[PDB]
Amino acid sequence: DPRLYFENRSKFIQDQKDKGINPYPHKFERTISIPEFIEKYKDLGNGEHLEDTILNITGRIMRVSAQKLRFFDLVGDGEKIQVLANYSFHNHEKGNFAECYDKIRRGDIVGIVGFPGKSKKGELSIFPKETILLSACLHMLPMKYGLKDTEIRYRQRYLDLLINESSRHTFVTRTKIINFLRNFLNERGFFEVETPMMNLIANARPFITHHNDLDLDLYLRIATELPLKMLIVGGIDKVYEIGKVFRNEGIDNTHNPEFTSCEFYWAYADYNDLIKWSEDFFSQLVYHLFGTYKISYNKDGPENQPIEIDFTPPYPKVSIVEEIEKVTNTILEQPFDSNETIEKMINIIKEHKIELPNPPTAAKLLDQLASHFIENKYNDKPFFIVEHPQIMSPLAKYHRTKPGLTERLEMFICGKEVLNAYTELNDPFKQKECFDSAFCTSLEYGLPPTGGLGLGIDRITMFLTNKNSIKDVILFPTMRP
Amino acid sequence: VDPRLYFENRSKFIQDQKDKGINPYPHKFERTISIPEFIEKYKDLGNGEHLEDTILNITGRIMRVSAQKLRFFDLVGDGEKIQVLANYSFHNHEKGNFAECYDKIRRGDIVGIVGFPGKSKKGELSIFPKETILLSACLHMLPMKYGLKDTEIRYRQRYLDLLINESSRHTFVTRTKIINFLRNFLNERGFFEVETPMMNLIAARPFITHHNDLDLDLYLRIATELPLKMLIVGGIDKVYEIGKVFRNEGIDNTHNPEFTSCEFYWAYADYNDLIKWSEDFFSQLVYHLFGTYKISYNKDGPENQPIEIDFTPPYPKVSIVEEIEKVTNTILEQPFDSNETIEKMINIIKEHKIELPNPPTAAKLLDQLASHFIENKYNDKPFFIVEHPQIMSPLAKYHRTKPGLTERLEMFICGKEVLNAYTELNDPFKQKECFDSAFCTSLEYGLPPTGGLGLGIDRITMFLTNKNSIKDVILFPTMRP
Lengths: 481, 481
Ligand SMILES: COc1ccc(OC)c(Nc2ncnc(Nc3ccccc3S(=O)(=O)CCCNC(=O)[C@@H](N)CCCCN)n2)c1
Ligand SMILES: COc1ccc(OC)c(Nc2ncnc(Nc3ccccc3S(=O)(=O)CCCNC(=O)[C@@H](N)CCCCN)n2)c1
Hints:
The structure is a homodimer of 481-residue chains. By secondary structure, chain A is α+β, with helices and mostly antiparallel strands. Chain A contains 13 helices and 18 strands. In chain A, 30% of the residues lie in helices and 24% in strands. An eight-stranded mixed beta sheet of chain A has the order 6-10-11-18-17-16-15-14, sandwiched between helices. Chain A has a five-stranded mixed barrel with strand order 1-2-3-5-4. Chain A has a three-stranded antiparallel beta sheet with strand order 7-9-8, with no helix packed on it.
């Protein structure tokens, strides 16, 4: 019984207390980490002991086996050495050999005083002259299988990190990705800021909460767009923010209501500048992690074959309106709001037995046509969908040569959006929504020509760590109790 | 001079240009060089010297206009400035006539210029235009510095502040330099940056928001303390987070409901390690920014003389129970919850006419005592208040020699708490609050001896950019409309 094992250990904790031994001592003076231990002593010869060097080392006992030789696994920082407790090397003054090492269970945190060496079998080991209990583990830890089907991976992420080596590697990579992005932006002149997480006016339903001092209801931000643009007016010409945004909608495998975004604004940047930034960032980010531009991705899970994703630039550019016509052998033109055009779009959706969006707005229909007919055109390499109609992007600047369109771009990997960008509409007389109030007033003080860009960091982490669910890249995903 | 009329005249002018076939918001300008690169490239040339064969493309905001065929302007970009020297004889009359091109320009307009670099006779570094294009007109009058002084126009329109006030740019660059410095200080030392949920199930009064898909009510984090500690259990022995936390209380000069905190956790660290880290970080940060350990701070406004704060380590330490006892000449006995001891502290509050907190709890009583008798003991230098009673820090580990106390430290600058740290209580049985539930469970898997520490990023910034109010280091402080 896990229940009964917990009570035995808890009684042991009192038992130790009433023998005068504190099972939770204050401080152990460590000399060296486990990863530093492995590097420093990996190339010794087999069976060799460095008996003069005395080290203080800590770690988590992860495996216990045995009659006067005791073997443990000691793990720290995702790496592992062996503990070889020899009765001959023990300091019999500190207590009975057997009594000390019989109390120890898998999962215990211990401090060890000892010397480094390799086994006769060549396993690099610490040879304890003394071993102190530093913090007991009171439950039975599980082994790997316990954490494959269940969702305690998500409710008890600390157990996952201890048991599954890959989980650590996933979450190191996530941190490496964000470091690379921050460094990539800082090296190019960009300036990182923080804008508010609550605002008075907030596409998506907001999180709402009551602010007790102002006696007002506030909204968690759904993006960082408006405050960053104001900083462009203010003269910070390259500005960005990495932080959480919130959309109070349904969960699925690539949608978490709270997620991590990077948005930047680049004054005097145009469409080519933005395309170039996107190809440089992804191609260099992949190479930095993997030493190659090609990665394998299990688009349909580990039970199915992976596809290969090639991040070698340049990436294809697919114009959305033109492409929908070609694959559908249709012609969609004029006001796309034209009921005529709408009907062509609506009849395409029913002929191919697709869901009709409610309401059947021209922007919603075009999006639906793109997810079915364009968004899975390539899967072997990322690509852009470009030049969306103005009705789908009311904040975007008009395309320079094609009427009705914008210079917008969207990057896709395996049919999922990861990057969104366009040049900004800066003539206040043509921004329809200026019939948020602060942004319109700021526009009248002069916004230079500007490009904005946003990245979805969780999804980017999913592809580069071969995950299909967003919960596998968020440390503590929010679940019902 | 009506602000109303000035806007209508500039608006009419914009439509007037559009009717004339000129686009006052052209799509793009191919800038070849920024104003800071211009200054760096040509600051060393000689008086009156021209380089007229080098044509350059430059952009910026017109901030000064002077008054018949030699026009003068001030062009700023990236917080730097050059002169625009418009001469009839180098103006391309192919593109239009000199007088009306330059008569249309107003203070605030964004322009693109093709021209060559040179220095005037009086020595002012200048761009000499051959062609000047409007990129985005400024439609309102731009305030003077004095209009941005007693006002809260600085907060509602931070972009005007950033355009007019040289100092404000410096404040916010400093903030970013501080966070950059902290992140690299921790990364150099093996710490691992992570992200933790902004909404949790169990959480100062909190912000409460409703989650639609789970249909549960969640609380914004008031701290990142608990999940970081769960990552320690899970084997991430050096972990930290920089992000917002939220406290749903009243605004004042050192309290904003959303603020920026950094928290780190360092397994196998104790009181002495955290003290040392604090001194190392603060003394090295001030030296990094200013080149000296000593800075001037206007504790009482820019209207009063500054004080000198010396960050040369080491900083004094002061025991909270002992020191209150000295200055109040009254002994407070170890059962700090005793009716005798509570009554004794209430009386001192009465005798000195201090506010009695509600409820009059021993922890609140000790804090009130500390705020009045210790926390302003030093202003010449930062100092620590240490060894708080267990009843004030129910998550802190017990002091190893003094019964009733902990090994807790709090760092103060100029009467204000900036940093708060302790060895963590890691015995699940001694957790009185463990009658959050996810965290009590996590402790039962074994938390090594750990030291934790939290910093107030906004407060540190105020002291290092000579500010009195937190609103002056937060880009967009939230205020009633
Ligand atoms: C529909 O939105 C929802 C709705 C409900 C949700 O959960 C309940 C989630 N949640 C969610 N979780 C994780 N990843 C994503 N990625 C995502 C989803 C949809 C579209 C794109 C991405 S994306 O390309 O990865 C990142 C965003 C990029 N673009 C921007 O930031 C623009 N604002 C600034 C561009 C600059 C122009 N001036 N979403 C999202
Ligand atoms: C009740 O608090 C409120 C209430 C209302 C507010 O606005 C309406 C604000 N708002 C606010 N804005 C800016 N700065 C501050 N600073 C502050 C305030 C009070 C005490 C200290 C500071 S501090 O030293 O700058 C931050 C240090 C935090 N240390 C920690 O969290 C530890 N758990 C770290 C782990 C220790 C090891 N396990 N506060 C705060």
